Amino acid sequence: AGDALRCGEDGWLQGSGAVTLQQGGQTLSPTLWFLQGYPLAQVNGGDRALTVVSANA
Amino acid sequence: VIHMPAAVAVTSPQADSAPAQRFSLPQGCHFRTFWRDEANGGSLFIPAGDALRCGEDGWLQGSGAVTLQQGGQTLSPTLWFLQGYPLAQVNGGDRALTVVSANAQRLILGGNPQAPGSFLLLTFEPQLHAWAFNGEAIVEMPRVDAADETKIKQRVQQAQTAWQPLLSAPAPLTFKLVEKLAADRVDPASGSYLSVNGATHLEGSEFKLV
Amino acid sequence: HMPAAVAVTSPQADSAPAQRFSLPQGCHFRTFWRDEANGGSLFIPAGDALRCGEDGWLQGSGAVTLQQGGQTLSPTLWFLQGYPLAQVNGGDRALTVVSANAQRLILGGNPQAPGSFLLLTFEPQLHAWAFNGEAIVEMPRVDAADETKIKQRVQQAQTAWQPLLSAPAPLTFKLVEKLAADRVDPASGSYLSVNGATHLEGSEFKLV
Amino acid sequence: VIHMPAAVAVTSPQADSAPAQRFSLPQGCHFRTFWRDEANGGSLFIPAGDALRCGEDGWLQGSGAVTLQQGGQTLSPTLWFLQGYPLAQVNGGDRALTVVSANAQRLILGGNPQAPGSFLLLTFEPQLHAWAFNGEAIVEMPRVDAADETKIKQRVQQAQTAWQPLLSAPAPLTFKLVEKLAADRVDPASGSYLSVNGATHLEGSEFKLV
Amino acid sequence: HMPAAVAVTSPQADSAPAQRFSLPQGCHFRTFWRDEANGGSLFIPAGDALRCGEDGWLQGSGAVTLQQGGQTLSPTLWFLQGYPLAQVNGGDRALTVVSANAQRLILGGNPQAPGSFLLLTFEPQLHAWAFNGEAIVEMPRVDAADETKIKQRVQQAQTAWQPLLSAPAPLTFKLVEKLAADRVDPASGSYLSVNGATHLEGSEFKLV
């Protein structure tokens, strides 16, 4: 919880915050930037109108 | 012909005296328990809400769920706090109980006014970082009085009637009789001269295939 | 609604006849004994309730002694038409052996519930057929669309058969449109099962 | 620019049609479930009392504890009976629900009036001889309507608000969206075109040692 | 009541001095490097916030590059008196290095909570001391009979130290009557532990 991440009017979570992931004892805390709802790591475009050209698994 | 139960020597070794660690909460208070750091990679999560709440004694007070996570395993016992100690499978709400003794091995619960001279025995469960009730109980009673079968059945049903409500399930309460509680040793019932085991009633229909 | 039909898939039962075992007073008893070099013994005690009836078959209920490989068993066996049966005693009534081979025996002719049968499996260690809880009810799938008719027919078989029983098991019923009396499994084709309970009441002591 | 979720073919095989076995109780009624006799040596014990009781429909009715014992292991789920089926982790008391489908593999729960076109999915657990709810839910919804992000969030929060109370814990409800429920196949959500996962809120204090 | 005294059992700390590493602009930095044929590399980036101070020590906070065995680490290190420290940055205040050897470093001189210290363990892979959550509070056992005095002293150390921290761990405090500054374990003798929490709030997604 906090202001780093928040819901926008587009229906997607927005912002750039730490997200915690735990699996079998391990813990990762990457900073994720949400672009059109997709969580991205190691890149932050803030409010730039970047385009997701293609996203899959 | 009076048959007295034979005397049993107190043989158990001295209990460990190491203090419990403290766990400070946001609103100032402590609970206390033991947690031998064994690279277990464990977490204890006190939820926020009503069930638990700091008290004017300096201790976390109340009873509510508590989430323990270790090695991908998640347990969620309901813990009740007494003088800051977390206890599973006993809730002495409304009642003012004493912690006779507490260490990394066991906790002796006393102070029930409706059956003095009886004590619950709780065993430390590192998986919960808490003391848990598994049915074991202790009745202090002179061997001379246990010569009388009817005194036995009186004291032991006194204990049962006083401690039963505080317990989650009407459980098989097991009662060891002892001359003196040995609160200083690992087994406080060391020197127990007799054990009385209770039943749980069963009724209904059992299905089975072959 | 009608339960689905089920194809009889069990193969034809073995057809060997039981061997006869002749007792000195004239009668015979019939069971199977696969020669297994077990060197087993079958002892029928004399002077008890096991006696030669006028019909030529050993009759009555009593303990039979089986010794094989050092071990000794002595079930109580009731003989119906010369067949040793365990865990069932029909004395008062007059039941019939529908079918009997080295694998299983079917028990019918209970007049307080026709179209129902007990199944008993051959126990080679007892050289006898034993009842273990398995009953078959004959009833058309059309009838079994009515729940109340399933309850009626099951409760009729239960009452009619429970007095004669002593298996350490409750009765369970396989519903068939016809008994496959010539198969290994005579309930091959059963379109439904009803399992009954054993009632319990008492005190349990467990020490942890 | 309308983006429609792509269509997913219904591929799962036909569900098994084998009937459930019946289990008759003293007062006449049945419950039904599956129990592949695997020499498991298992027992099912319906206690006597109020929680369970035969009903005028010919089925065991109500919700209460049930003791399962197998290979020295003892489980005690609270089961709720619906049309004679035992179900764990869902109690639709006060509500009139439908069993869309039931077999040895899964049970589809329907009939919630406050969110039509949604179905719970329960999976058969042989350890309990019962169907259990683990969060999986199904929303029937035309792909064309799921082009609209706001219709998705409407139907899915309609489902959540209708089915939430019937559930034991406010659980992470997972919702698969499908054009038609495939009640005839092992996976009734075969051909689901989208999944929506809910969260569980967390708040309070976590302790941890190193 | 008074908590029981505890004997200092930890052995005397190793006494080797840290090696010096000379930078071209004059300054030195001091850490340990057990020759382990690791052929490790220590790269101090230039032109950043890592600079030679007038006192002769490398100063500031910035990323240091460690390459050993193909793998590369680049922690952010803050240099206090020439010592590389990880997960703690005291810049605003003026802290002192009570003790430093190849095994551990003690961090004192926090004026908003005297008699408290941070412990930092040597991490040979970083060639640097790292803070992991361990604080020591100096307080006499007599004082620790008062619960309110334990809370006071612990909450003073918490507030005074938490701004300077970035360990992925909450603070936990070992209460000693005196810091065993010359032992391997400087809390050898601690008569009580107080563990603090990390607060959580947010949404959890788990897929089963």
Q: Structure tokens of D103?
A: 């077999």
Contact E168 A27 (CB under 8 A): yes
The residue numbers preceding gaps of C to N over 2.5 A in chain A are: none
Asked if D87 and D132 touch (Cβ cutoff 8 Å), the reply is yes
Q: Contact at 8 Å (CB) between D191 and D185?
A: no
Q: What angle do CA D154, D157, D162 make, to 5 degrees?
A: 120
Of the partner residues D174, D198, D202, the one whose CB lies closest to the CB of residue E200 = D202
Q: Do C200 and D17 touch (CB under 8 A)?
A: no
Pairing of strands E128-138, E172-176: parallel
Q: Which of B125, B134, B173, B202 to mutate to test the interface with C (most CBs of C within 10 A)?
A: B202
B135: which chain C residues are within 8 Å (Cβ-Cβ)?
208
Structural tokens at position E56 = 């002769």
Name which of B69, B64, B96 is nearest B79 in CA terms. B64
Give resolution, Å, one decimal. Answer: 2.5
d(CA D141, CA D192): 10
Alpha-carbon gap, residue C160 to D125, rounded angstroms: 35
Stated as kind and residue range, the H or E segment containing C113 is: none
Q: Which candidate, D138, D131, D81, places its Cα nearest to that of D107?
A: D131
- Paired tokens of E193: 């532990």
Query: What does the alpha-carbon distance between residue D71 and residue D59 come to, in Å, rounded to a whole number?
Result: 29
Please count the other Cβ atoms lying within 10 Å of the Cβ belonging to residue E5. 9
Amino acid at B58: G
Q: What is the DSSP string of D145-206?
A: GGGSHHHHHHHHHHHHHHHSTTBSS----EEEEESS--TTBS-TTTT--EEEE--EEEEEEE
* Alpha-carbon gap, residue B173 to C208, rounded angstroms: 11
Are B59 and B83 spatial neighbours (Cβ–Cβ below 8 Å)?
yes
Say yes or no: E83 contacts chain B, CB-CB below 8 A: no
Measure the CA–CA gap between E65 and E73, rounded to whole angstroms.
Answer: 6
Q: Return the closest-CA partner of residue B65 out of B49, B48, B80, B77.
A: B77
User: What element of type H or E holds B163?
Assistant: helix B149-163
Q: How far apart are CA A47 and CA E140, in angstroms?
A: 56
Please give the structure tokens belonging to residue D149: 């992000």
Chains touching C (at least 3 CB pairs under 8 A) are B, D
Chain A (9-38) residues lying within 8 Å, Cβ to Cβ, of chain B? 23-25
Q: Is D93 helix (H, G, I), strand (E, B) or coil?
A: coil
Q: Alpha-carbon distance E39 to E36, whole Å?
A: 8
Is the pair C, E in contact (3+ CB pairs within 8 Å)? no
Quote the distance between the C-alpha of residue B108 and its chain's center. 6
The rounded distance, in Å, linking the Cα atoms of D198 and D173 is 6
Backbone angles phi, psi at B156, to 5 degrees: -75, -35
Question: Which of helix, strand or coil describes residue E162?
Answer: helix
Q: How many CB atoms lie within 10 A of CB C88?
A: 21
Q: Cα–Cα distance between B32 and E195 in angstroms, integer?
A: 10
Contacts of D149 in chain A (CB under 8 A): 11
Q: How far apart are CA B121 and CA B132, in angstroms?
A: 8
Could you give the 3-state DSSP secondary structure of residue D85? Answer: strand
Structure-determination technique: X-ray
* CA neighbor of E197 nearest in space, from D156, B30, B73: B30
- Tell me chain A's radius of gyration from C-alpha atoms: 12
Whether the CA torsion E29, E32, E36, E40 is positive or negative: it is: negative
Helix (H, G, I), strand (E, B) or coil at A13: strand
> Does residue C194 belong to the interface with chain D, where contact is any CB pair within 8 Å?
yes
Which pair of tokens denotes residue B181? 């509680």
Q: d(Cα B61, Cα B97) in Å, to the nearest integer?
A: 13
Sign, Cα dihedral of D156, D159, D165, D166: negative
What's the one-letter identity of residue D87? L
Q: Is the CB of residue C161 less than 8 Å from the CB of residue C187?
A: no
CA distance D194 to chain E (A): 15
**Start-end of H helices in E117-170:** 147-161
Quote the distance between the C-alpha of residue C173 and its chain's center: 13
Residue D165 phi/psi, 5° resolution? Answer: -65, -35
Residue C203 with chain B: CB contacts under 8 Å: 199-202
Measured CA to CA, the distance from residue E187 to residue E173 in angstroms comes to 10
Contacts of B25 in chain E (CB under 8 A): 197
Q: Are strands E128-138 and E83-86 parallel, antiparallel or unpaired?
A: parallel
Residue owning tokens 């532990």: E193
Q: Give the tokens for residue E155.
A: 């909450």
C168 at interface of B, judged by CB pairs closer than 8 A:
no
Give me the helices (H) in C67-178, please: 147-161
Residue E99 structure tokens: 């003790």
Q: What one-letter code names the amino acid at E3? A: P
Looking at beta carbons, which residues of chain B come within 8 Å of C199?
204-206
The rounded distance, in Å, linking the Cα atoms of E120 and E129 is 6
Could you tell me if E74 and E44 are in contact, meaning their C-beta atoms sit under 8 angstroms apart? Answer: no
Give the three-state DSSP class for D121. Answer: strand
E156 neighbors E162 (Cβ within 8 angstroms): no
Contact residues, chain B, for E199 at CB < 8 Å? 26
Eight-class DSSP state of B40:
-
Single-letter amino acid, residue E16: A
Give yes or no for a contact between C108 and C186, defined as CB atoms under 8 angstroms apart: no
- Closest by CA position to E178, among listed E189, E169, E193: E189
Are B50 and B67 in contact, with CB atoms under 8 Å apart?
no
Region label for D26, one of left (φ > 0), alpha (ψ between -120 and 50) or beta (otherwise)? alpha
| Pairing assessment for the beta strands E198-204 and D200-208 based on DSSP bridges | antiparallel
**CB proximity B170 to C under 8 Å:** no
Please name the residues between 126 and 165 in chain C that touch chain D, using a CB distance below 8 Å. 147-148, 150-151, 154-155
